[PDB]
Design a protein around this motif. Structure first.
Motif, PDB file in Angstrom:
ATOM      1  N   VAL A   1       0.850  -1.169   0.000  1.00  0.00           N
ATOM      2  CA  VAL A   1       0.000   0.000   0.000  1.00  0.00           C
ATOM      3  C   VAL A   1       0.891   1.225   0.000  1.00  0.00           C
ATOM      4  CG1 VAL A   1      -1.745   1.336   1.260  1.00  0.00           C
ATOM      5  CG2 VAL A   1      -1.848  -1.186   1.323  1.00  0.00           C
ATOM      6  N   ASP A   2       0.553   2.213  -0.829  1.00  0.00           N
ATOM      7  CA  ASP A   2       1.212   3.509  -0.655  1.00  0.00           C
ATOM      8  C   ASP A   2       0.215   4.646  -0.747  1.00  0.00           C
ATOM      9  OD1 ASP A   2       1.216   4.966  -3.393  1.00  0.00           O
ATOM     10  OD2 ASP A   2       2.025   3.029  -4.007  1.00  0.00           O
ATOM     11  N   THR A   3       0.599   5.796  -0.152  1.00  0.00           N
ATOM     12  CA  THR A   3      -0.204   7.008  -0.207  1.00  0.00           C
ATOM     13  C   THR A   3       0.377   8.025  -1.221  1.00  0.00           C
ATOM     14  OG1 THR A   3       0.941   7.793   1.792  1.00  0.00           O
ATOM     15  CG2 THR A   3      -1.172   6.729   2.146  1.00  0.00           C
ATOM     16  N   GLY A   4       0.975   7.512  -2.287  1.00  0.00           N
ATOM     17  CA  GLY A   4       1.488   8.389  -3.354  1.00  0.00           C
ATOM     18  C   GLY A   4       0.381   9.033  -4.201  1.00  0.00           C
ATOM     19  N   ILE A   5       0.730   9.529  -5.385  1.00  0.00           N
ATOM     20  CA  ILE A   5      -0.177  10.391  -6.177  1.00  0.00           C
ATOM     21  C   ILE A   5      -1.332   9.571  -6.810  1.00  0.00           C
ATOM     22  CG2 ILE A   5       1.337  10.205  -8.240  1.00  0.00           C
ATOM     23  CD1 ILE A   5       0.619  13.298  -8.704  1.00  0.00           C
ATOM     24  N   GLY A   6      -1.133   8.267  -6.978  1.00  0.00           N
ATOM     25  CA  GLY A   6      -2.223   7.475  -7.502  1.00  0.00           C
ATOM     26  C   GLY A   6      -2.365   7.612  -8.989  1.00  0.00           C
TER      27      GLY A   6
ATOM     28  N   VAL B   1      -4.729  -4.197  -8.726  1.00  0.00           N
ATOM     29  CA  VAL B   1      -4.196  -2.872  -8.409  1.00  0.00           C
ATOM     30  C   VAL B   1      -5.372  -1.934  -8.187  1.00  0.00           C
ATOM     31  CG1 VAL B   1      -2.766  -0.881  -9.167  1.00  0.00           C
ATOM     32  CG2 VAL B   1      -2.058  -3.217  -9.674  1.00  0.00           C
ATOM     33  N   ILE B   2      -5.517  -1.496  -6.936  1.00  0.00           N
ATOM     34  CA  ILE B   2      -6.511  -0.508  -6.542  1.00  0.00           C
ATOM     35  C   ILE B   2      -5.868   0.860  -6.457  1.00  0.00           C
ATOM     36  CG2 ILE B   2      -8.199   0.077  -4.720  1.00  0.00           C
ATOM     37  CD1 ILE B   2      -8.744  -2.724  -4.957  1.00  0.00           C
ATOM     38  N   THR B   3      -6.491   1.861  -7.046  1.00  0.00           N
ATOM     39  CA  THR B   3      -5.803   3.164  -7.068  1.00  0.00           C
ATOM     40  C   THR B   3      -6.779   4.317  -6.988  1.00  0.00           C
ATOM     41  OG1 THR B   3      -3.996   4.429  -8.230  1.00  0.00           O
ATOM     42  CG2 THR B   3      -5.669   3.503  -9.614  1.00  0.00           C
ATOM     43  N   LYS B   4      -6.325   5.410  -6.386  1.00  0.00           N
ATOM     44  CA  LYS B   4      -7.150   6.602  -6.246  1.00  0.00           C
ATOM     45  C   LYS B   4      -6.250   7.838  -6.408  1.00  0.00           C
ATOM     46  CE  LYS B   4     -10.598   9.409  -5.004  1.00  0.00           C
ATOM     47  NZ  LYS B   4      -9.910  10.734  -5.316  1.00  0.00           N
ATOM     48  N   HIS B   5      -6.515   8.621  -7.453  1.00  0.00           N
ATOM     49  CA  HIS B   5      -5.817   9.858  -7.753  1.00  0.00           C
ATOM     50  C   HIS B   5      -6.778  10.956  -7.340  1.00  0.00           C
ATOM     51  CE1 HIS B   5      -4.317  13.238 -10.257  1.00  0.00           C
ATOM     52  NE2 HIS B   5      -3.199  12.546 -10.440  1.00  0.00           N
ATOM     53  N   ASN B   6      -6.232  12.090  -6.899  1.00  0.00           N
ATOM     54  CA  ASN B   6      -7.085  13.240  -6.536  1.00  0.00           C
ATOM     55  C   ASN B   6      -8.072  13.670  -7.640  1.00  0.00           C
ATOM     56  OD1 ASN B   6      -6.214  13.663  -3.821  1.00  0.00           O
ATOM     57  ND2 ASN B   6      -4.537  15.044  -4.431  1.00  0.00           N
ATOM     58  N   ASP B   7      -7.709  13.487  -8.914  1.00  0.00           N
ATOM     59  CA  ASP B   7      -8.571  13.953 -10.013  1.00  0.00           C
ATOM     60  C   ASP B   7      -9.540  12.908 -10.553  1.00  0.00           C
ATOM     61  OD1 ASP B   7      -7.090  16.301  -9.728  1.00  0.00           O
ATOM     62  OD2 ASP B   7      -5.912  16.035 -11.537  1.00  0.00           O
ATOM     63  N   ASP B   8      -9.758  11.819  -9.825  1.00  0.00           N
ATOM     64  CA  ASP B   8     -10.631  10.775 -10.334  1.00  0.00           C
ATOM     65  C   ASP B   8     -11.210   9.954  -9.191  1.00  0.00           C
ATOM     66  OD1 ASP B   8     -12.051   9.300 -12.330  1.00  0.00           O
ATOM     67  OD2 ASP B   8     -10.296   8.818 -13.495  1.00  0.00           O
ATOM     68  N   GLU B   9     -12.038   8.986  -9.569  1.00  0.00           N
ATOM     69  CA  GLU B   9     -12.618   8.026  -8.636  1.00  0.00           C
ATOM     70  C   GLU B   9     -11.705   6.809  -8.415  1.00  0.00           C
ATOM     71  OE1 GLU B   9     -14.940   9.420  -6.921  1.00  0.00           O
ATOM     72  OE2 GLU B   9     -14.872  10.950  -8.516  1.00  0.00           O
TER      73      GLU B   9
ATOM     74  N   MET C   1      -9.846   4.648  -0.253  1.00  0.00           N
ATOM     75  CA  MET C   1      -8.534   4.749   0.374  1.00  0.00           C
ATOM     76  C   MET C   1      -8.035   6.172   0.576  1.00  0.00           C
ATOM     77  SD  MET C   1      -6.440   3.168  -2.888  1.00  0.00           S
ATOM     78  CE  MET C   1      -4.887   3.443  -2.450  1.00  0.00           C
ATOM     79  N   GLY C   2      -8.688   7.178   0.049  1.00  0.00           N
ATOM     80  CA  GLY C   2      -8.092   8.489   0.306  1.00  0.00           C
ATOM     81  C   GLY C   2      -7.340   8.948  -0.928  1.00  0.00           C
ATOM     82  N   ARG C   3      -6.182   8.306  -1.159  1.00  0.00           N
ATOM     83  CA  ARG C   3      -5.286   8.647  -2.244  1.00  0.00           C
ATOM     84  C   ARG C   3      -4.152   7.617  -2.237  1.00  0.00           C
ATOM     85  NH1 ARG C   3      -2.812  12.626  -0.315  1.00  0.00           N
ATOM     86  NH2 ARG C   3      -0.875  11.480   0.120  1.00  0.00           N
ATOM     87  N   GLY C   4      -3.863   7.009  -3.382  1.00  0.00           N
ATOM     88  CA  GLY C   4      -2.647   6.236  -3.553  1.00  0.00           C
ATOM     89  C   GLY C   4      -2.865   4.985  -4.373  1.00  0.00           C
ATOM     90  N   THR C   5      -2.081   3.940  -4.084  1.00  0.00           N
ATOM     91  CA  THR C   5      -2.157   2.669  -4.827  1.00  0.00           C
ATOM     92  C   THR C   5      -1.991   1.492  -3.867  1.00  0.00           C
ATOM     93  OG1 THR C   5      -1.276   3.722  -6.823  1.00  0.00           O
ATOM     94  CG2 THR C   5      -1.054   1.281  -6.751  1.00  0.00           C
ATOM     95  N   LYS C   6      -2.801   0.456  -4.061  1.00  0.00           N
ATOM     96  CA  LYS C   6      -2.597  -0.832  -3.392  1.00  0.00           C
ATOM     97  C   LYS C   6      -2.429  -1.922  -4.418  1.00  0.00           C
ATOM     98  CE  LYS C   6      -5.948   0.282   0.320  1.00  0.00           C
ATOM     99  NZ  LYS C   6      -7.297   0.080   1.014  1.00  0.00           N
ATOM    100  N   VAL C   7      -1.320  -2.657  -4.286  1.00  0.00           N
ATOM    101  CA  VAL C   7      -1.017  -3.788  -5.125  1.00  0.00           C
ATOM    102  C   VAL C   7      -1.228  -5.040  -4.280  1.00  0.00           C
ATOM    103  CG1 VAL C   7       0.763  -4.949  -6.587  1.00  0.00           C
ATOM    104  CG2 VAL C   7       0.756  -2.417  -6.402  1.00  0.00           C
ATOM    105  N   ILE C   8      -2.177  -5.878  -4.695  1.00  0.00           N
ATOM    106  CA  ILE C   8      -2.492  -7.109  -3.984  1.00  0.00           C
ATOM    107  C   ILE C   8      -1.971  -8.240  -4.806  1.00  0.00           C
ATOM    108  CG2 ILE C   8      -4.380  -8.543  -2.945  1.00  0.00           C
ATOM    109  CD1 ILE C   8      -6.284  -6.146  -3.367  1.00  0.00           C
ATOM    110  N   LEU C   9      -1.112  -9.039  -4.201  1.00  0.00           N
ATOM    111  CA  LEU C   9      -0.466 -10.153  -4.866  1.00  0.00           C
ATOM    112  C   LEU C   9      -1.109 -11.425  -4.343  1.00  0.00           C
ATOM    113  CD1 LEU C   9       3.342  -8.886  -4.424  1.00  0.00           C
ATOM    114  CD2 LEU C   9       1.726  -8.506  -6.397  1.00  0.00           C
ATOM    115  N   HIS C  10      -1.853 -12.093  -5.211  1.00  0.00           N
ATOM    116  CA  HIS C  10      -2.444 -13.415  -4.937  1.00  0.00           C
ATOM    117  C   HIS C  10      -1.361 -14.395  -5.319  1.00  0.00           C
ATOM    118  CE1 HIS C  10      -6.447 -11.341  -4.929  1.00  0.00           C
ATOM    119  NE2 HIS C  10      -5.861 -10.608  -5.869  1.00  0.00           N
ATOM    120  N   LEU C  11      -0.609 -14.790  -4.303  1.00  0.00           N
ATOM    121  CA  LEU C  11       0.615 -15.539  -4.477  1.00  0.00           C
ATOM    122  C   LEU C  11       0.322 -16.957  -5.008  1.00  0.00           C
ATOM    123  CD1 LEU C  11       2.733 -14.638  -1.264  1.00  0.00           C
ATOM    124  CD2 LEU C  11       2.807 -13.572  -3.484  1.00  0.00           C
ATOM    125  N   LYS C  12       1.280 -17.504  -5.774  1.00  0.00           N
ATOM    126  CA  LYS C  12       1.287 -18.897  -6.202  1.00  0.00           C
ATOM    127  C   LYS C  12       1.511 -19.758  -4.991  1.00  0.00           C
ATOM    128  CE  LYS C  12       3.519 -17.991 -10.775  1.00  0.00           C
ATOM    129  NZ  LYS C  12       4.876 -17.641 -11.451  1.00  0.00           N
TER     130      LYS C  12
END
Ligand code: AB4
Length: 210
Positions: free
Chosen positions: A77-82, A135-143, A165-176
């Motif tokens: 998870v990060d709170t970057g620009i998305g 990949v779940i993501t949220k940028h300030n200029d979009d949904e 989430m506010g703002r940022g990106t979540k990468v979910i890895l469904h592992l092998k």
């Protein structure tokens, strides 16, 4: 509701090379994802210098690592620009501004998969260890959006509403099935310490509830 897209041919070829190439040093996936997070965090930090309202969606600049043995997922998870919807679809589904072409040429001329980050395609090293990536993501200029792909040449995008989430990106890895070492606290700390010890944002490794 759900839109399905084709990966650009070169991206599907690259993904197939990552899934199909015999390569034991899989642990670099985590460095490449943390490094994209750090990049996304620098960009929001930069923007907020000249416009402090860019942080209205969240002030904290950090990266969270969330393992879950029950679901068999590792989530970054990060709170970057998305990413906006258009950025998500271009960034993950096309060559865009990456060196996809140079990387595939390089591996033919003796480069190895550990060098994927030099070519702006380190994200796809996720497929070293994951059968499926969301990949779940949220940028300030979009949904908020969810992109998903188990490779095979396509990916989906839908709106994501359960859990804003506010703002940022979540990468979910469904592992092998054979890659669950990457849910072990010790293994994660080792890899973070080996490859990501200089990242300039807090990296918090979550503890598991059971
Ligand atoms: O320079 S970026 O556009 N930075 C950026 C901006 C917003 C973001 O949400 C991210 C980002 C993340 O924050 C986290 C995971 C990502 C996975 C693939 C692509 C980008 C990811 C990265 C970028 C784009 C691509 Cl396709 C690959 C790497 C990077 Cl650093």
């Amino acid at each position: 509701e759900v839109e399905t897209f084709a990966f650009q041919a070169e991206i599907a070829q690259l993904m197939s090379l990552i899934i199909n190439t015999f390569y034991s040093n899989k642990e670099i996936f985590l460095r490449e994802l943390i490094s994209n997070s750090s990049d996304a965090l620098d960009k929001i930090r930069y923007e907020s210098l000249t416009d402090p309202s860019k942080l209205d969606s969240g002030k904290e600049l950090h990266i969270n690592l969330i393992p879950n043995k029950q679901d068999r997922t590792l989530t970054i998870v990060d709170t970057g620009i998305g990413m906006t919807k258009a950025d998500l679809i271009n960034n993950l589904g096309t060559i865009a501004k990456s060196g996809t072409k140079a990387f595939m040429e390089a591996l033919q001329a003796g480069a190895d998969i550990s060098m994927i980050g030099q070519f702006g395609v380190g994200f796809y090293s996720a497929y070293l260890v994951a059968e499926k990536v969301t990949v779940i993501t949220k940028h300030n200029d979009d949904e908020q959006y969810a992109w998903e792909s188990s490779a095979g040449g396509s990916f989906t995008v839908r709106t994501d509403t359960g859990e804003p989430m506010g703002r940022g990106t979540k990468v979910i890895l469904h592992l092998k099935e054979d890659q669950t070492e990457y849910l072990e606290e010790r293994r994660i700390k080792e890899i973070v310490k080996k490859h990501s010890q200089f990242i300039g944002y807090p990296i918090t490794l979550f503890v598991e509830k059971e």
